[PDB]
Design a protein around this ligand. Structure first.
Ligand SMILES: [Mg+2]
Ligand SMILES: [Mg+2]
Ligand SMILES: [Mg+2]
Length: 373
């Protein structure tokens, strides 16, 4: 039902900022899981108290309050990209231009655009910092796979200009003007509180430059370390820190085990949710490859179908969830975590849980077939 889920999801006092749920995609629908048991600026959300599918042991999920005050910068960058004339000639290796990628995302409604991920995975950002984060989501959308293009290709010149614009290294088009404003916005927020603003741009530069390794893996860890690069996990962590105005050193070796587990969790959950979408892209030739943890597990262990592969990949997710809670409890018991460090770890798990909630209630992975009512 559409009504029951959306009433019991959040408290009715926050029903003004609550974003309604229109889909309920269950990516474990055909998997044999009968032997797998699951057990300010933000307000709590309770999926386990609704009929929604919830393939995780996590319990804390939150939604950004002023999420509606940020679709403006998301819509702005998209229409500015699709209208830019240089972005119409900046083509990827498959010939599709940046302008069409922006117009393609402008077709899906503002409710379920890719910037809605930030609403659930960066829930702690205030009204101003979420605007800058939602803008960087569009930068990821646009400049994905832009490292494949050569330096002198027009996409390589556009991407290299975007990188120069992010360092703060002459008429400027309106799109360059808005990109300038975003870069300046992060510097302004860093002056106020925390130093994660430059890190987000820095790891965004690292995303446009670092080429991922080749595409077949002898172990699952070989895949997940490549997938840590693919999902832009260092960038993702920098937004978590920037969302709280934090100054934590994300690269602290004390946090390296639990943060690598968070990337493993985010990588497996996303690959589980998007397998059916990604499988069809290889079936009808829409994509040349098939990179996914479900397919990797099916091959590495000779499972006869993707249904059994989803069951084992889901088993690994619940294993990582257990290690995450074990590692976090050990860090808390040892007293070696500062209050700003545990607040960042709490928000990192809100990214892992919010990654599951959106992947269930989005149209990106369930299509129209999972529509409620
Ligand atoms: Mg991806
Ligand atoms: Mg994917
Ligand atoms: Mg998508």
């Amino acid at each position: 039902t559409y009504t029951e889920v959306n009433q019991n999801l959040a408290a009715r006092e926050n029903a003004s900022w609550f974003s309604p749920v229109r889909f309920a995609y269950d990516w474990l629908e055909d998997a044999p899981i009968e032997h797998l048991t699951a057990v300010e600026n933000s307000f709590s959300i309770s999926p386990q108290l609704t009929g929604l599918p919830w393939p995780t042991s996590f319990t804390k999920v939150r939604q950004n309050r002023h999420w509606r005050q940020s679709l403006r910068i998301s819509t702005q960058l998209l229409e500015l990209f699709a209208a830019d004339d240089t972005s119409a000639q900046a083509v990827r290796r498959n010939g599709v231009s940046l302008a069409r990628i922006a117009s393609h995302e402008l077709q899906t409604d503002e409710e379920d655009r890719f910037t809605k991920f930030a609403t659930y995975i960066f829930p702690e950002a205030n009204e101003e910092r979420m605007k800058l984060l939602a803008a960087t989501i569009v930068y990821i959308i646009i400049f994905d796979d832009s490292w494949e293009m050569h330096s002198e290709d027009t996409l390589g010149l556009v991407r290299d200009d975007f990188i120069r614009r992010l360092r703060g290294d002459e008429h400027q088009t309106p799109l360059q003007q808005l990109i300038n404003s975003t870069v300046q916005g992060f510097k302004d927020q860093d002056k106020t509180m925390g130093n994660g603003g430059q890190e987000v741009l820095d790891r965004l530069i690292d995303f446009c430059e670092h080429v991922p390794p080749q595409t077949k893996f002898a172990t699952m860890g070989d895949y997940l370390s490549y997938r840590l690069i693919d999902v832009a996990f260092p960038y993702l962590l920098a937004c978590i820190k920037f969302s709280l105005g934090s100054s934590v050193n994300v690269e602290d070796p004390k946090l390296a085990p639990i943060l690598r587990l968070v990337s493993d969790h985010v990588s497996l959950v996303n690959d589980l949710a998007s397998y059916d979408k990604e499988k069809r892209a290889y079936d009808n030739g829409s994509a040349c490859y098939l990179i996914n943890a479900v397919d990797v597990a099916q091959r590495l262990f000779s499972l006869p179908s993707a249904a059994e592969a989803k069951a084992l990949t889901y088993s690994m997710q619940l294993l990582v969830e257990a290690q995450i809670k074990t590692e976090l409890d050990s860090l808390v018991a040892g007293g070696i975590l500062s209050c700003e460090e545990l607040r960042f770890l709490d928000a990192a798990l809100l990214m892992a849980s919010g990654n599951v909630f959106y992947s269930v209630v989005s149209s990106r992975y369930g299509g129209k077939a999972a529509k409620l009512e």
